[PDB]
Structure formats: C-alpha cells, structure tokens
Amino acid sequence: VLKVYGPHFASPKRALVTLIEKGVAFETIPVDLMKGEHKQPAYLALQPFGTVPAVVDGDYKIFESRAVMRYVAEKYRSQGPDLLGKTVEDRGQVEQWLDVEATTYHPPLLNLTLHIMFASVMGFPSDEKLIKESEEKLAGVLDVYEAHLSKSKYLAGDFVSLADLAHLPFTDYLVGPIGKAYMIKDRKHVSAWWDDISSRPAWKETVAKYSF
C-alpha cells in the first residue's frame, strides 16, 4: 500500500530499485512534469519543493530519493540483502558513498542529462560550454571511482549497498540516451562494477516496469 510518485523519471527509480531489492509491496502514481502537475497544489502538499519522488506510506509521508532509500532499507532491514551493511562502520561507508553520489557524482551528470536529453527544457542555444565542463568534472569523479573500485568490489566494501544502487538511474542514461557509454567502458573496474549492479534482477525489473 506504500506509494511512489513519478516512477517514469530517474530519481524515483532509486526508491523503486530499493523497494524491489527488499521485496516490499508497493504501488506507483504517475506525475505529469511536462504539464506541471508537480508544481500544482495537490502534489505540493506531498513534496513542498515540487519534485519527484514522493512516497506515501500509510500515515507516513517522506521525500528525497536517497532519504527514501534509507528509510525503506531501515524499516525492512531484516529482510532481503542488507543494503546498509552489518555494522555501524559498514553503514558509515554506505552513507559516505551515498553522499558522494548526491554531492559529487550526480550534479555534473544531472547537467549532462538536462542539456543533452532535455535540451528543450533548458532552452537554446544549448550551453555547449557547460556540457564540456560537466563531462570533464564527471570523468574526474569517475577516475577516483576507478582507483577505489580496484581496491573494493562495491562502493562501500564487499557487499552491494544503497550507495551502488543510487548510481543506477542516471548512469543508465549516461551509457544510453546521453550517448557517453565510453566514460564507463574506458575505466575497467568501473565498467565491471557497472555491469554487475545494472544486471541485478531488481534493476532489470525496475527498467522493464517503469520506463517510457
């Protein structure tokens, strides 16, 4: 009966894949960003910043895609894989790389998404300069990942976690519609790691059900 708003967009898929990994029953509710449903009063009561996702769970409301990941992972900690790790220290590392995704990986990748995939939304002429800068910044981030993932199977250690999962929705864009698969492929450890998490059954199901 848990409900996810806006499943066709990328951020909500962070929540979707966590839910599916955890075997949690849920439903989705469409939100029309193009016509501005997300900026109208009905949706602003759930998410006051007017962005997707938002989750409604019984009496409970929560937004911010990674906060939703953490909440699902904690509420359902005792079933499925432990996406938060086993110890406090393990969880520190999950938190660490989740924050890296939010503050450091995602922002330039967001710029690439917006200006290549949704250029119309950003207006013309397109910012070719910001596109170059964002590609450069993301490559630097990826260089760190390549070194790191050569010493660790997943981001937070030897277990898949929220931190890995958080990279799924927009990196899927990067290697597909954005047209920059080489940024992943040219970095061997990253590429094996990418191949691992994006072929996980939960992610395959997320994509089958909540695209287009």
Added chain:
Amino acid sequence: VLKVYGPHFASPKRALVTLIEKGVAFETIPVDLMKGEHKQPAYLALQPFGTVPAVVDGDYKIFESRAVMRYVAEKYRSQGPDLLGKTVEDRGQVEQWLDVEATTYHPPLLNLTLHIMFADEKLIKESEEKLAGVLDVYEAHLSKSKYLAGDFVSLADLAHLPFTDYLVGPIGKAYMIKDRKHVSAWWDDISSRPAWKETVAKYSF
C-alpha cells in the same frame, strides 16, 4: 582518539558540532590550502576528492561531512541528545531534511559564499533568489514543526549551521533569515546552542 581534518572550513563544522553535541573527545588537524596540502598524496589517501573534512577514528576512515554526522550519531547514539530521533519514521524525516540541506539548500548558498566571500553579479542574484525560494518553504514548514525533522533537534538542523553562519555574517544577508519569523526563531534557537557556540569560538578563520 578521533581526528578531524580542516576544522577552520565550514563543511567540517557539521561534524565538529555533532561531536560536541554528543560529548565525544576528538582532535583536529589543520589543512593548508595555500600550500595545496589537500592536493598532495598524504591527504588524498584520506580523502580522495581532495576536500575537507577527513575523519579518522582509530583504523576507521570516513569522509563527507554529513556521512560523518550520521556515523557519530549512530556510534554514540546512547549518549547526549539523540540527533537521529527515536523511531524509524523519525529517522526518515532526519534523512529527508539532511538531503534537502545537501541537494537544495546548500548549492545556492555555496554560490553566494564563493562569490561574495572568496572573490559574477548575475549568478549572485540568481542564487539569492533560488535560496529565497528554498527559505519560503522552510518558513511554511517551521510553522507546523518546531525543528526540521519534528519536535526534536537533529542532524538535519545542525547541517545548516556553518554556511548559514556565513549568510547572516560575512555574506551580509541576514535579512534572508530575519525577515522570516519562523525560520528566524529557529535559527536563533539552534545557533545559540552551546555546542555550536563552542565550535565557533574554537574554529573560526
């Protein structure tokens, strides 16, 4: 003893104030940007992105200021105030507003900080407007809720301290807080807490 790198910068103070709220012993170690210490190998082995803070706790290394806040609050959960709330739902709201601070509140305020304190007139106007929109939402929320995550002070409130300190001081835009009655009452509360006053006395500029 736990060690924090770069206490004079704003972002590490999120970790410093959490440590002091929780009554945890720690030491700090300076990072010299002017000499590029942060881009040299020793420091990159602690923090591979070359930014502050970096925290070492015995053999355990952890970075990202809010990740450190969570780690400290979990590890020392049973002492001091509980900055994580009591329930899972409680903690969900702390995570929600922590992410709001990171993804929505801080980026325009970081822009104001870089361009007013450490130097683009247009980007300043745009970022102020963006932050004002963010603050309007906080104003509405803090009317129905004493602190961000509910009726208890939490990591989410504390995460706002260091750069907002800049906003009401050196950046010169205190009116953005003061003109909003609930936001302003909230700021007066959390920024008057002894742990933050002690952080500021010890680690400002």
